[PDB]
Amino acid sequence: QQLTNHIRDTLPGLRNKLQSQLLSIEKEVEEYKNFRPDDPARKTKALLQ
Amino acid sequence: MVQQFAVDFEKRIEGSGDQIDTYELSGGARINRIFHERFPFELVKMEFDEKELRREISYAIKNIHGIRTGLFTPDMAFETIVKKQVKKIREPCLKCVDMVISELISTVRQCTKKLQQYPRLREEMERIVTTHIREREGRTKEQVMLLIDIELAYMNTNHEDFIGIRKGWLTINNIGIMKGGSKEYWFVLTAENLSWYKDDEEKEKKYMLSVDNLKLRDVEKGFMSSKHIFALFNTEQRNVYKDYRQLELACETQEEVDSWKASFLRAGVYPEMDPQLERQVETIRNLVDSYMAIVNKTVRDLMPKTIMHLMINNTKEFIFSELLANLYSCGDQNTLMEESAE
């Protein structure tokens, strides 16, 4: 019972770490997931930036 | 044009660059520094009648002591007055946010309608920016509320609170026959004691008197009627410690006499419950003012910082990084960038 209580008590720490990593990465994968080689608009946006 | 818009907006609101409008206006988003120096006005537009504050404090004490006899002023009599005063500033903070949003919308319009000849483009580039501004209105208001709510959550008396009232010159007209004449001196009246000085350095400390157990009266016209006169007299002892014929004191006007009397009344003196409660009420009133000065100071400082972080900087980041991505998403990209007849 103590081993089970310990293993469950650490879940909140792991959940916050994974949630933090998704928030940091999300801003860029949102754009990478929409990559298409045939996209003159993507090229134009990069040029302006 | 997108490049020119982003650059023009940033110059106008930050104030950087050349070609500044040195003559015509105080304008171009430098108006916002007025709100940050106008919001300090709304925080003092509010007023209260002190008699309502005294009544409210009195019921606060009696309602904290439910049945018990009171020895010391309860702390909750302080906390529940401060919480009630702080709730009042929710409104002016929201007015400040709304005024700032209004100026951002006006500035976006100047940088858009006046510089672009293409139809439809000046609509998309105005619509998108004002939509983004409105969403930040939402996030900004939540943060302001979670700041005032924090001011209520805990009372901190460590930094600048009053850590544990009237001044002017008076002349004594009736001097003992061994000296004669009249003596002009510096008088300091506090809520606790009276102190006599020879000058405004307040170094001599020649006389000290208690405020308690003294009485005030007017004087009969047995004198050359050139000054207004009152008397501070004692009925519990034959002398006012160091006495000068019941300390008859002349003033230039009756209004000065009445202001003095009012100051004595504030200090605890009675006119020509009462023993215990009135002293407790005055202690709380003073402590409340000293703490509210700190609350107001902190609010004036943090509000413009909250707005800059949450509304202004995110708008600039949007203009530089996202604006073009959204214009490609509007309409059908066929009627956009179609020349007007002119």
Of B143, B82, B136, B62, nearest to B105 by C-alpha is: B136
Q: How many of the other CB atoms lie within 10 Å of CB of B89?
A: 19
Which residue in this structure is represented by tokens 């930050």?
A: B14
From chain A, pick out residues whose CB is under 8 angstroms from the CB of B2.
48
Angle at B235 between CA B229 and CA B241, to 5 degrees: 80
Is B8 strand, coil or helix?
helix
From chain B, pick out residues whose CB is under 8 angstroms from the CB of A41.
328
Angle at B14 between CA B38 and CA B116, to 5 degrees: 110
Q: Kindly report the nearest CA distance between residue B28 and chain A, in angstroms.
A: 26
Sort B290 into a burial class: Cβ within 10 Å, 0-12 / 13-18 / 19+. Answer: middle
- Resolution for the entry shown, Å: 4.0
Of A31, A36, A35, A46, nearest to B324 by C-alpha is: A46
Listing DSSP states for B38-49 in one string gives: THHHHHHH----
B324–A45 C-beta distance less than 8 A: yes
B325–A48 C-beta distance less than 8 A: no
Q: Rounded CA gap, B9 and B107, in Å?
A: 8
A45–B2 C-beta distance less than 8 A: no
Of B10, B7, B50, nearest to B288 by C-alpha is: B50
B324–A44 C-beta distance less than 8 A: yes
A49–B325 C-beta distance less than 8 A: no
Give the single-character DSSP code of B120.
T
b/e per residue B30-58 (b: at least 16 CB within 10 A): ebbeebbeebbebbeeeeeeeeebeeebb
Q: Kindly report the nearest CA distance between residue B7 and chain A, in angstroms.
A: 13
Is B68 strand, coil or helix?
coil
A49–B328 C-beta distance less than 8 A: no
Sheet strands (E) in B9-128: none
B3–A48 C-beta distance less than 8 A: yes
Q: Rounded CA gap, B227 and B229, in Å?
A: 6
Q: Rounded CA gap, A12 and B98, in Å?
A: 39
As separate numbers, helices (DSSP H) first and strands (DSSP E) second, chain B gives 11, 7
Q: How many of the other CB atoms lie within 10 Å of CB of B303?
A: 23
Is B73 strand, coil or helix?
coil
Report the structure determination method.
cryo-EM
Give the C-alpha distances (Å, rounded to integers) separating B120 from B114, B324, B328: 14, 15, 13
Listing DSSP states for B152-204 in one string gives: HH----SSSS----EEEEEEE----TTT-S-EEEEEEE-SSEEEEESSTT---
Query: In this complex, is the C-beta atom of A1 within 8 Å of any C-beta atom belonging to chain B?
Result: no
A44–B321 C-beta distance less than 8 A: no
Query: In this complex, is the C-beta atom of A48 within 8 Å of any C-beta atom belonging to chain B?
Result: yes
Query: In this complex, is the C-beta atom of B325 within 8 Å of any C-beta atom belonging to chain A?
Result: yes
With CA atoms as reference, the chain A residue closest to B320 would be A49
**Structure tokens given for B175:** 């001097």
Residues 6+ apart with CB under 8 A from B65: B74
A41–B328 C-beta distance less than 8 A: yes
Query: In this complex, is the C-beta atom of A41 within 8 Å of any C-beta atom belonging to chain B?
Result: yes
Of B295, B284, B287, nearest to B57 by C-alpha is: B284
From chain A, pick out residues whose CB is under 8 angstroms from the CB of B3.
48
Contact between residue B151 and residue B86 where contact means Cβ atoms under 8 Å apart: yes
Sheet strands (E) in chain B: 166-172, 183-189, 193-197, 207-210, 215-218, 228-233, 248-251
Q: Kindly report the nearest CA distance between residue A1 and chain B, in angstroms.
A: 39
B328–A48 C-beta distance less than 8 A: no
Q: Rounded CA gap, B14 and B308, in Å?
A: 12
Inter-chain CB pairs, A–B, below 8 Å? 8
Query: In this complex, is the C-beta atom of B329 within 8 Å of any C-beta atom belonging to chain A?
Result: no
Q: Rounded CA gap, A21 and B40, in Å?
A: 41
From chain B, pick out residues whose CB is under 8 angstroms from the CB of A45.
324-325
Residues 6+ apart with CB under 8 A from B316: B9, B10, B13
Which residue in this structure is represented by tokens 């009462």?
A: B274
